[PDB]
Symmetry: D2
């Protein structure tokens, strides 16, 4: 059997409430990894599992300094001969951010599979148990190697690059509308469908193994009447990058243009993404900033932060956005 | 034939470039309403049409003060016996905002149909000509009365309350994933599917006739490492409301909580929405602010601006979010 | 509390296996309604429930003669003052067919809510317990009245007329891509979004309480090299109707045309639907047969079968396909 | 510039009508390939194009004998040093079938791109011109090689193996809900997203060069009261294979089981697929026949027909369904 580490970080998957129908005020923070494992003892027939408690927080509170440590720990685990893959339990709210950070920074072809749940562990028809079992199946299959970092919920295997939480509250929220899933897990069998045509993991230039902090990057929203003062505030607080969740295809109002021009004069890198949820922001030399290709705001922030650890060259950063 | 006013505001539907393949740097601002009409002379068999040029701007520059004037003008038109319906040509980037605003403020059951195009008028396979024909058909049909404000592109009829631009760049971008379309237009026939189960138009409390300005509302994004100082800046600049484009189901970090509590202390109403794109932000009394129900951030800002013209009572605002 | 009858018919929702991971060869037929109810005792806080075993079969084996009895039983139940609504447990494979039959023939505004599960009751993370809770919530809510027949799974409420099983094997399979959900159930709360703009239940002409047999209607697929001899076979076996699951918008090959013409010569009513999954088959006088509007093949067969109990006039049948 | 051959087969892309709004009774058969090319002279900046007229039919009339000749012609063209790629204009109704056939039988890594249109060439906002331009851009790009056969409409690049016509009548009908698109074309730029993880073209065992006919395979629908006599009829008429468009996950009624057992006794290979539109039909040793993995009925028919040119060994055929 393959040797799989289950690295727990918190989330609703490790949430507990006093009744099976409670959806608010459940606690995250007191349910440990061994309790998740013991709730699905069937995982032991798929892998020799070892639980490790990395953190126990609601993912809305996950921070880049912590994600950096998570990436470094995973890289340490995967460098060992006795570890074949890692499953990371996490909250759904920012799993796409953590997963994509690891997607770019893990220097191994061994599987890294993020898993989460929309319903607490105590809920009627809680999704975490099956999601965990699926995640371990994926992480322990030799065919899963070399595919980049994965996010597994609800019988689906999503690439960290494309998958996003699309719905506030449903079980089937993780989707990649235009890019689909890498694979699905049905009837205890994995069906691989796609390989992402982007750079990741062992073919990625990003390396944060020796680093202790990351560039500050903020996200500003685009909408009617959007204010210029938010750009001033960001600049004043020392951002190195701004991701713009733009109207449409990264379209910018007269106020946003003024703000972006100010940020650029101070050396801030501006990436124009979209608030829409999907699709390409195309290049446009008449507008300020670089373009996010098909990276959503949350993903674009992660790529920009990592880009800034190794370059300041806008041509290179723009190429990263087209290739990662 | 029905009498329809085509009230033009700008957008890529009135955009023009020197070649049929140009997708950036096309111009908006020089193509008038009568040129759109004359490009589809078939429209004169569907309705007696009259063009009126309201504005000629890219919709990323549309502002609340202008949308207020647009609502006021549409109400004046619809009050006339010689107007059966109004089609409004608009940019796609913020049509959902303008349309939702009219949805809540137009005091007539006569159809109001926003129309837009993703490709400029000069493009190969431009979508605007057919979109416009479909919009005029929808606006003139008796079956279209009392449906709320509508957004028509790509053979679909979306309710202003549910429809959103879901993709930066595709023809099929307007979708309501969980709510579907009010109807479709196929083979020159309208097929109505649904009537929205929400308050609007003639049953709405909101009335902005005689207002000249609207309460200031900003939108802040939720993400890992989101900063408290953006809430400070908003407060400092006199916002009356903040809509939060939250992680997941309106989930808030420790930093966002601190910012939100500060804002509330200053009398700012906070609405927690979601960055996800879809779904319900459920109530949770322990967290700060009110919840957006299924309203996305852009829609929630419109509803909140209008709510603030009438009340500061959180109970009443929250009920508006569940009913409009 | 409302009074709800849970009328059980079988399905995977009532399926059982000896382990939590078994997805094939689980048994349907030996898990009774009271076993479903006692697995979610929380239901008793939502309603006073009474279980009634109507049948215990896999739904691929459900037949129109049995559906007719189901409809008759539900009408008896809903005519009682001590019954506020009915939840029907059913297999997912043909729930859309049973549900739409009831949608057209139940002569009450009281809620009728079909529920099903994609995982057996014994499965890890089985969906049926929460689905059943949600269905009883919907059936017991006074706001659920007058909506037509509903199908509830995975936190969604679909209209029988629009919902379909879109995926062989996933929890989120039930969707209505173009028409959306009537509502959703999140955080123990119902959010109604739409009302269907079609005739049903108390405004439907179909009444089968005195119906003594059902007309025979077959469905034939359209594809390259489709054979004429299947139409011959259908005609020879006495079908009264054929639903064609056509290529595209009910497009017919030269062979299909020959078959359809033959069928019509013999008095068989032909409806051209689509194999695509969604959308409108528009009228086309140059082709044989009537058109299905937006009814998929399974739904079109149900409506045709009912229509044939009342009329053989193609103009009347065609108008039923545009209004129901 | 690359050398691209446009090989025309017919379809609505080559349809013509007397007015721009006519959606029925337009003619296919009178617009030649040069007329398509001359409608988009911009194409000549993308490629050196040569048109060849293979056929001029509505695709609902396309047959396996003709597709076999199309595949043979494409293989001849791609064997030339002076041909860099081929674009094939085709009707939308059965493009998925012709494309998948070629996906399995073209013995080159040079791009083969099918293109189609939902509106006739004469329509207001006809989609064919831009679709054709996009197809030529894709076929001419060196990065397009080795990707399998592609289907291009509406700014999307779909794999022949996953793409299907999902809606009877809309421009955005071609989708792969679970698998996404191989890429997209926005702003005159190609964005590749995925490589399919299936065998195709140069890695495929199939070579039909030299064959003039194919094994007979019919598709039978699954539904409530489905009849055994359609199985009898197919067997009687000499089918070598039956694809079942099953209820749910290839679920079979007692009548379908009887028919399938009869067919298998006569040496007919039965594949259980799904009518649902998407997803996996899993193995089940208790049911008759092989399973279609995620192949929909139309695609499963093509693979089975090809498989039958080489083998009747169910173990091999089943592996093919999992790998092609
Ligand atoms: N707030 C939780 C939500 C979840 O995990 O479903 C988290 O992200 O930690
Ligand atoms: N920026 C344009 C985009 C469009 O109309 O498609 C607008 O919103 O005015
Ligand atoms: N064959 C089962 C499938 C399910 O219920 O999910 C049924 O329809 O009865
Ligand atoms: N019947 C046409 C439809 C189209 O091309 O859109 C065809 O498949 O040839």
């Amino acid at each position: 059997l393959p040797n799989i580490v289950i690295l727990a970080t918190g989330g609703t998957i490790a949430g507990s409430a006093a009744t099976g129908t409670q959806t608010t005020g459940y606690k995250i923070g007191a349910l440990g990894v061994d309790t998740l494992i013991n709730a699905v003892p069937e995982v032991k027939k798929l892998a020799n599992v070892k639980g490790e408690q990395f953190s126990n927080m609601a993912s809305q509170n996950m921070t880049g300094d912590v994600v950096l440590k998570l990436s470094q720990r995973v890289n340490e685990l995967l460098a060992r001969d006795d570890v074949d893959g890692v499953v990371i339990t996490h909250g759904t709210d920012t799993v796409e951010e953590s997963a994509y950070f690891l997607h770019l920074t893990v220097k191994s072809d061994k599987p890294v599979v993020f898993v989460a749940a929309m319903r607490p562990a105590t809920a009627i028809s809680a999704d975490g148990p099956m999601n965990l079992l699926e995640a371990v199946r994926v992480a322990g299959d030799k065919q899963s190697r070399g595919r980049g970092v994965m996010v597994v919920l609800n019988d689906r295997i999503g690439s960290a690059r494309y998958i996003t939480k699309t719905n506030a509250s449903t079980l089937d929220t993780f989707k990649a509308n235009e890019e689909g899933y890498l694979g699905v897990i049905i009837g205890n069998r994995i069906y691989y469908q796609n390989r992402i045509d982007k750079l990741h993991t062992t073919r990625s230039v990003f390396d944060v193994r020796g680093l202790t902090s990351l560039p500050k990057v903020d996200i500003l929203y685009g909408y009617q009447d959007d204010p210029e003062y938010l750009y001033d505030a960001a600049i004043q607080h020392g951002v190195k990058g701004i991701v713009y969740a733009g109207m449409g295809a990264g379209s910018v109002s007269v106020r946003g243009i003024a703000g972006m021009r100010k940020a650029m004069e101070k050396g801030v890198v501006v990436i124009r993404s979209t608030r829409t949820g999907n699709g390409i922001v195309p290049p446009d030399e008449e507008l300020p900033g670089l373009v996010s290709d098909s990276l959503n705001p949350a993903h674009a922030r992660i790529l920009l932060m990592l880009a800034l650890t190794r370059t300041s060259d806008p041509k290179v950063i723009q190429e990263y956005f087209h290739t990662y």
